[PDB]
Enzyme design. Structure first.
Site, mmCIF file in Angstrom:
data_model
loop_
_atom_site.group_PDB
_atom_site.id
_atom_site.type_symbol
_atom_site.label_atom_id
_atom_site.label_comp_id
_atom_site.label_asym_id
_atom_site.label_seq_id
_atom_site.Cartn_x
_atom_site.Cartn_y
_atom_site.Cartn_z
ATOM 1 N N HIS A 124 0.827 -1.211 0.000
ATOM 2 C CA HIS A 124 0.000 0.000 0.000
ATOM 3 C C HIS A 124 0.865 1.266 0.000
ATOM 4 C CE1 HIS A 124 0.621 0.402 4.395
ATOM 5 N NE2 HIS A 124 0.287 1.663 4.186
ATOM 6 N N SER A 168 4.024 3.208 7.941
ATOM 7 C CA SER A 168 3.599 2.338 6.856
ATOM 8 C C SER A 168 4.796 1.738 6.111
ATOM 9 C CB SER A 168 2.731 3.139 5.886
ATOM 10 O OG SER A 168 2.434 2.380 4.730
ATOM 11 N N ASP A 176 -0.501 -7.437 1.888
ATOM 12 C CA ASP A 176 0.096 -6.117 1.842
ATOM 13 C C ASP A 176 1.616 -6.239 2.001
ATOM 14 O OD1 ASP A 176 0.527 -3.454 1.858
ATOM 15 O OD2 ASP A 176 -0.368 -2.997 3.779
#
Length: 390
Positions: free
Chosen positions: A188, A338, A237
């Protein structure tokens, strides 16, 4: 009108095939060299040699040499060095050389570094390999004491998280170095720059995200898990980024280890993992200095069910994810950036390995709202398969 040609005297380390008492018109002879020696007419190796006595008094071809095969100077080993075993500068048939990697930050893979000069003119390992060995970075080294959790946010010291990577340009995210030319991150985080690897400004070796003193790298290619769907949850992911060049490995830059088969032992419910970052995906303000937090794995069933209470979507937490977080670590403490790596300590090897990838989670840093991470161990064959093609 049929007379003899001068009796053929073979060169050193060669012999004449048909040994006749005398050779006359139309007759013939070839020269074959000993093993490890090659036919040379000047600087040109010959397929073979055969001289035929013509109508003249002379042979049609002059004697060639049988000269020892030379494998040439051994190529330089990146992050390593070479030693001559047989003797200084000796590179001919059956000479032995020995490769070594730089002592503490690299280890030797692919063989033991010993090569012999073979008859085909190639330096050859004991396994028959005619390519250089590879000096792989030692992984999982850190400057930290242990997993001695001292509750909440903490400031990173130099060498604590040498695998830490900052990803700039189109995106703002984190990653972890694998070997010396790969970066593990979340799909992502870099999905939008899937068709534009050049726009990923990759930096490492620095505690301070704004420092002009960092180590620069560039992406060659980006590999998104084919099972990841951008507009539909965070299953699978995970992404890999290939660096254009290898980075120097030292105290400040060292890859994280990949989790081995038996890594599940150290990632059980209540086992302690560490997330590091600058707060890229929290809110408010970014930290100038790298921070980290020790957090326990939370029972998967407890986390699954926590993310099912209304108003929420179901199927959110899959078997491809793990959950970690504290039950009251305000602001300072949270999921991580992230793409960042959630690391654990193999106590048997004293090596840190990546167990999770910061993927998603609640905005309210907390009780009942844990971070969710890509379960790296489920993707080892996916990772191995990509890194083996390069």
């Amino acid at each position: 009108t049929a007379h003899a040609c001068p009796y053929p005297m073979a060169p050193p380390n060669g012999h004449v095939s048909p040994v006749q008492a005398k050779y006359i018109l139309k007759d013939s002879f070839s020269i074959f060299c000993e093993t490890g020696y090659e036919l040379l007419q000047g600087h040109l190796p010959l397929k073979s040699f055969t001289a035929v006595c013509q109508k003249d008094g002379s042979w049609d071809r002059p004697m060639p040499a049988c000269s020892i095969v030379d494998c040439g100077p051994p190529d330089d080993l990146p992050s390593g060095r070479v030693e001559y075993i047989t003797g200084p500068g000796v590179t001919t048939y059956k000479a032995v050389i020995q490769y070594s990697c730089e002592e503490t930050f690299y280890t030797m893979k692919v063989n033991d570094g010993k090569y012999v000069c073979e008859a085909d003119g190639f330096w050859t390992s004991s396994k028959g390999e005619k390519s250089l060995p590879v000096c792989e970075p030692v992984c999982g080294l850190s400057a930290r004491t242990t997993g001695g959790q001292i509750y909440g946010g903490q400031k990173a010291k130099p060498g604590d998280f040498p695998w830490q990577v900052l990803i700039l340009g189109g995106t703002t995210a984190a990653g972890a170095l694998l070997y010396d030319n790969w970066v593990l991150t979340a799909a992502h985080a870099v999905y939008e720059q899937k068709h534009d690897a050049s726009a990923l400004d990759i930096r490492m070796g620095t505690l301070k995200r704004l420092s002009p003193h960092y180590t620069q790298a560039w992406s060659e290619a980006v590999f998104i898990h084919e099972g990841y769907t951008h507009d539909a949850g965070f299953d699978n992911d995970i992404a890999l980024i290939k660096l254009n060049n290898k980075v120097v490995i030292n105290s400040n830059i060292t890859p994280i280890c990949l989790p081995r088969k038996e890594a599940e032992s150290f990632m059980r419910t209540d086992d302690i993992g560490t997330a590091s970052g600058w707060g890229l995906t929290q809110r408010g303000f970014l930290a100038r200095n790298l921070m980290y937090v020790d957090i326990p794995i939370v029972d998967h069933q407890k986390c699954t069910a926590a993310y099912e209470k209304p108003p929420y979507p179901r199927g959110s937490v899959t078997a491809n994810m793990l959950c970690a977080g504290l039950e009251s670590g305000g602001k300072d403490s949270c999921r991580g950036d992230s793409g960042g790596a959630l690391v654990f300590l193999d106590s048997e090897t004293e090596r840190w390995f990546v167990g999770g990838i910061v993927s998603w989670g609640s905005m309210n840093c907390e009780a009942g709202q844990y971070g969710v991470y890509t379960k790296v161990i489920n993707y080892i064959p996916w990772i191995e398969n990509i890194i083996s093609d390069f």
